[PDB]
Design a protein around this ligand. Structure first.
Ligand code: FES
Ligand SMILES: [K+]
Ligand SMILES: [K+]
Ligand SMILES: [K+]
Ligand SMILES: [Mg+2]
Ligand SMILES: [Mg+2]
Ligand SMILES: [Mg+2]
Ligand SMILES: [Mg+2]
Ligand SMILES: [Mg+2]
Ligand SMILES: [Mg+2]
Ligand SMILES: [Mg+2]
Ligand SMILES: [Mg+2]
Ligand SMILES: [Mg+2]
Ligand SMILES: [Mg+2]
Ligand SMILES: [Mg+2]
Ligand SMILES: [Mg+2]
Ligand SMILES: [Mg+2]
Ligand SMILES: [Mg+2]
Ligand SMILES: [Mg+2]
Lengths: 128, 72, 86, 137, 74, 97, 48, 117, 122
RNA sequence: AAACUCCAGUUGACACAAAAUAGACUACGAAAGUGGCUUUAACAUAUCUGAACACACAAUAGCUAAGACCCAAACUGGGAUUAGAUACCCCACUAUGCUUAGCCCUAAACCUCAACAGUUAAAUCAACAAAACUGCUCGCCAGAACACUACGAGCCACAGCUUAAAACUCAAA
């Protein structure tokens, strides 16, 4: 996970954020935010690391990255909430929709399909 | 009609005239219609601002002796 | 039990008129729905039965308010016949 | 001053008095109007019991207790024992929707007591214990 | 009914016929029974109001068509 | 073509939409004075929107604030706080004949 | 603009240095969140 | 304001489950219900219970209970006439908002139209 | 996030109330909170009797603490307040000033529902 | 009538139960379900349809084990009614409804109205119900009864569940 001192995605590119008081840096960091703010930072890191255009969010690559971050959040949720049937369904459906994205990415752009698998640590498996 | 915008503003600013409509007279002119005709005349003289074209119209009628009691 | 007493559901009597004070209290408890609530709570109303009662009461309100709205709308026409004989 | 149906609030300075006593000092007539009986207890402002009467203690039995006239008789009996102890004005606190809900109050008046206020304390659970199952009749 | 008197007079003045009253079932489609086998029906029916007093089409509109009588109507 | 023909546009005489008395105002659970204006004086029962005249959004805001304030120790449940009985009457209900 | 506004507010935040002084200052003051609404939509602040 | 009916009934196009399950079509009839006779109750029992109290203390001797007896007698007479009064005013509609008979003639003139003509 | 601690304290003298507030604000800071303000709402009669720590209370001092803290501090602070014998009732809510009120154009009227029943003659 | 009379009424202390009013709102969730308060996490899919060969869920009741226990309450006992009363009515009380950990996998689980896209014109249209239709796709149906049955198979299910026939019979249903 990103360090708690990491600034929010909205306040990371404001001019002069490095010279503000330490208290102001704590209030604009992940430590003082909800987990959804930490997930936006994770999604941003994966985009720059994998996709050629980190600003295109509608490409099949970005969707696989966006959905992969949601999947990891559900897995962490269910690690603490093992009888949460609602989120267990969301996890299984999300895994099924990422496989459908990876299938369509493999069929259209194999070189990008390989970078998505390496970048996200996904082992593509053919259905039985 | 285009004048309906002028009538809506006139009724908001000055309300309905205390003069009574006579819908039997086919050539009846109300205070609102008199306001609309003056407002149209001044627009044809080249004025194009709306808030300015509305204040000058009220003054013209007051000069002619018309009673315009603002509602508020 | 933890609240202050003689504030809730309390009506003062005027000039010894206890009947009017009781009628006011009964009117207060009725309008706030307490009297009907107390009665429905004497025996357990199963949820299926409660949902049916609420549906019936809500449909009755809509019908009754719409019929009343039509009665008030048409009442002006209850005037004497202007064209009697034709 | 205009009449206020809202009771005087304790701790504030009201001008209302009954025999020189403040609202907080007037004894309380507790009427429990049940479906098959009516119980009346008069207590002082300090919660000292002064008189008790019910339809059963007035010689009514079985279904006759669950009548208006049975509660009225209980009210007169409680008023008589309370009047001997110095009670004139009472605050009425009635809990229950039984047939003697109003009749019990009449008996208190016919017995010589003056009701200055009426309070309903019928227990209404806000969600509470499950009541008994409906009757097939 | 506001114009029953006016319309009845207009018909009499022009030498024609008016029916402004309650329209009984079968005046047109059962005229021979009601009036007689030799009764002559109207050649033209003019409706100054086409609706009855419950805001429905006047029954004679349908019955005029059944008897193949042309109708003028406001 | 013809100058006197009607023109397409939006209703110029359309009246502004009506607003609830709390439109644009913040409903806080700590403002027991405001919340008390929407409960019964005798029973503390929350008034329905047909009595309060509030829109759906503010009827919910008032309801949620009352329930929060009651259990957090700010507002009584079984009666209206007598301190607030002389506040403006904004609800459409009369209990005296 | 939000970082600037926030940078000024932090000057008035409570710290372990001014904690005792801010507590005593709070005990002397009073904050009132009560106000009433009228049928006309007007706020009626309390009489204080 | 009448409660809303939008999205309340089970219908094609309505995604949510039905809010209302009317057993009768929500369509205004051309008639109102008939004035429902109110449940009668025993009356004058308060006066009846003062008369029967003196008797118990005076061995059922009418000479000692004259004032209480005359009260109960008058109270019954008033309730007997009161029923005669109410009945007349009920039929006349002197106090009623309107008579179901009069209110139905008015609806006959403006019948609800659930169909096209 | 930004939270609001609604704190009802046992009715005490000024010295014991200041010690309780300082002890409570330090507990927030020990859990990583950034305390923004402290507001006194005044001592008043409670809306009802509250039993807390084997005692019955009828009056209390109402205080507010506006502060920022990590999400994990809320659960840990709630546990702290449950053990403080000078606290009658303490609740932590999300600060109401964070929620921005959407603009409202007004009341959109609802027309009577139409075409609920076929127009066939019944 | 039986029942209680260490009972009843006032006051005070006092929940592993349930959640008035708001709600005349019609929201959330795949459905089942969800209407006291707070906080944390959190509500898949940037074409659609699509698994009865899988996976994950699924009210109430029920099973296994350990707890809680206000109230309600199958069964059972008593009272009453009755020709009888294995009922309806009254009282008492248990399993059970609650929590934890595992099972069971069923409902008129029905809003008996499939998903997605689109239309209101033509013939509007058996009847009733909740107006009539188009495109596309999956699932399902083909006289009644036998039959939510038999056998086989699968299953933590052992008086269970799912899948599910045939013979004889009828001219109807
Ligand atoms: S009408 Fe705008 S918030 Fe109520
Ligand atoms: K409700
Ligand atoms: K509740
Ligand atoms: K159904
Ligand atoms: Mg569709
Ligand atoms: Mg039906
Ligand atoms: Mg699909
Ligand atoms: Mg289940
Ligand atoms: Mg169970
Ligand atoms: Mg029990
Ligand atoms: Mg048990
Ligand atoms: Mg529970
Ligand atoms: Mg269901
Ligand atoms: Mg089905
Ligand atoms: Mg499907
Ligand atoms: Mg068959
Ligand atoms: Mg079965
Ligand atoms: Mg089987
Ligand atoms: Mg088998």
């Amino acid at each position: 996970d990103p360090p708690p001192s990491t600034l929010l995605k909205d306040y990371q590119n404001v001019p002069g954020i490095e010279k503000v008081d330490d208290v102001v840096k704590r209030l604009l960091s992940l430590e003082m935010a909800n987990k959804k703010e930490m997930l936006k930072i994770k999604q941003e890191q994966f985009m720059k690391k994998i996709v050629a255009n980190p600003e295109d969010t509608r490409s099949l690559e970005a969707r696989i990255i966006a959905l992969s971050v949601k999947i990891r959040s559900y897995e962490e949720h269910l690690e603490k909430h093992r009888k949460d049937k609602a989120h267990k369904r969301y996890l299984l459906m999300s895994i099924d929709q990422r496989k459908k994205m990876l299938k369509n990415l493999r069929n259209t752009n194999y070189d990008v399909f390989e970078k998505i698998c390496w970048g996200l640590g996904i082992e593509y498996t053919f259905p039985p | 009609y285009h004048e309906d915008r002028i009538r809506a503003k006139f009724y908001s600013v000055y309300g309905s005239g205390q003069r009574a409509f006579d819908l039997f007279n086919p050539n009846f002119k109300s205070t609102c219609q008199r306001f609309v005709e003056k407002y149209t005349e001044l627009q044809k003289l080249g004025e194009t601002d709306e808030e300015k074209l509305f204040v000058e119209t009220g003054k013209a009628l007051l000069a002619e002796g018309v009673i315009l009691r603002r509602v508020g | 039990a933890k609240h202050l007493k003689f504030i809730a559901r309390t009506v003062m009597v005027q000039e010894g008129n206890v009947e009017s004070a009781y009628r006011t209290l009964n009117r207060i408890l009725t309008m706030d729905g307490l009297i009907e609530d107390i009665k429905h709570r004497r025996y357990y109303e199963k949820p299926c039965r409660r949902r049916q009662r609420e549906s019936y009461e809500r449909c009755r309100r809509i019908y009754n308010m719409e019929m009343a709205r039509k009665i008030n709308f048409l009442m002006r026409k209850n005037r004497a016949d202007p064209w009697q004989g034709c | 001053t205009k009449f206020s149906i809202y009771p005087p609030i304790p701790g504030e300075e009201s001008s209302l008095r009954w025999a020189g006593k403040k609202f907080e000092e007037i004894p309380i007539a507790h009427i429990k109007a049940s479906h098959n009986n009516t119980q009346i207890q008069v207590v002082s402002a300090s919660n000292e019991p002064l008189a008790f009467a019910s339809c059963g203690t007035e010689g009514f039995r079985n279904a006759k207790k669950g009548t208006g006239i049975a509660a009225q008789t209980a009210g007169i009996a409680a008023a008589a024992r309370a009047k001997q102890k110095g009670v004139i004005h009472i605050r009425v606190v009635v809990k229950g929707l039984g047939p003697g809900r109003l009749s019990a109050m009449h008996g208190l008046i016919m017995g010589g007591l003056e009701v200055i206020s009426i309070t309903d304390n019928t227990p209404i659970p806000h969600x509470g214990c499950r009541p008994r199952k409906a009757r097939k009749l | 009914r506001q114009f029953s008197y006016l319309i009845e007079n207009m018909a009499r003045d022009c030498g024609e016929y008016a029916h402004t009253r309650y329209f009984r079932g079968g005046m047109l489609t059962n005229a021979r029974l009601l009036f007689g086998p030799t009764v002559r029906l109207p050649d033209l029916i003019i409706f100054l109001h086409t609706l009855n007093n419950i805001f429905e089409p006047h029954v004679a509109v349908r019955d005029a068509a059944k008897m193949n009588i042309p109708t003028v109507g406001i | 073509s013809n100058e006197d023909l009607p023109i397409s546009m939006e209703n110029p005489y359309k009246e502004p939409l009506k607003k609830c008395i709390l439109c644009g105002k913040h409903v806080d659970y700590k403002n027991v004075q405001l919340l008390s204006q929407f409960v019964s004086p005798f029973t503390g029962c929350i008034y329905g929107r047909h009595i309060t005249g509030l829109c759906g959004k503010k009827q919910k805001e008032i309801t949620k604030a009352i329930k929060r304030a009651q259990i957090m120790g700010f507002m009584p449940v079984t009666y209206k706080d007598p301190a607030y009985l002389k506040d403006p009457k904004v609800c459409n209900i009369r209990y005296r004949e | 603009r939000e970082v600037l506004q926030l940078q000024e507010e932090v000057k008035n935040f409570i710290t372990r240095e001014n904690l005792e002084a801010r507590v005593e200052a709070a005990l002397d003051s009073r904050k009132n969140y009560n106000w009433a609404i009228t049928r006309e939509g007007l706020v009626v602040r309390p009489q204080r | 304001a009448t409660p809303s009916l939008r999205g309340r009934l089970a219908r094609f196009g309505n995604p949510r489950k039905p809010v209302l399950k009317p057993n009768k079509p929500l369509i205004l009839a051309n008639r109102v219900g008939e004035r429902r006779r109110e449940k009668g109750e025993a009356t004058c029992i308060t006066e009846m219970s003062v008369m029967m109290a003196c008797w118990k203390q005076n061995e059922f001797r009418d000479d000692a209970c004259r004032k209480e007896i005359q009260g109960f007698l008058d109270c019954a007479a008033r309730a007997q006439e009161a029923r005669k009064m109410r009945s007349i005013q009920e039929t006349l509609g002197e106090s009623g908002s309107l008579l179901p008979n009069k209110l139905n003639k008015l609806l006959q003139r403006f019948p609800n139209k659930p169909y096209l003509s | 996030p930004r939270y609001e601690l609604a704190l009802i304290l046992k009715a005490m003298q000024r010295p014991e109330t200041a010690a309780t507030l300082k002890r409570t604000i330090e507990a927030l800071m020990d859990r990583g909170a950034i305390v923004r303000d402290l507001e006194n709402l005044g001592e008043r009669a409670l809306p009802y009797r509250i039993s807390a720590h084997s005692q019955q209370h009828n009056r209390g001092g109402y205080f507010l603490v506006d502060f920022y803290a990590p999400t994990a501090a809320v659960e840990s602070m709630v546990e702290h307040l449950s053990r403080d014998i000078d606290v009658i009732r303490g609740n932590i809510v999300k600060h109401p000033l964070t929620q921005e009120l959407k603009e409202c154009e007004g009341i959109v009227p609802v027309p009577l529902a139409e075409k609920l029943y076929s127009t066939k003659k019944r």
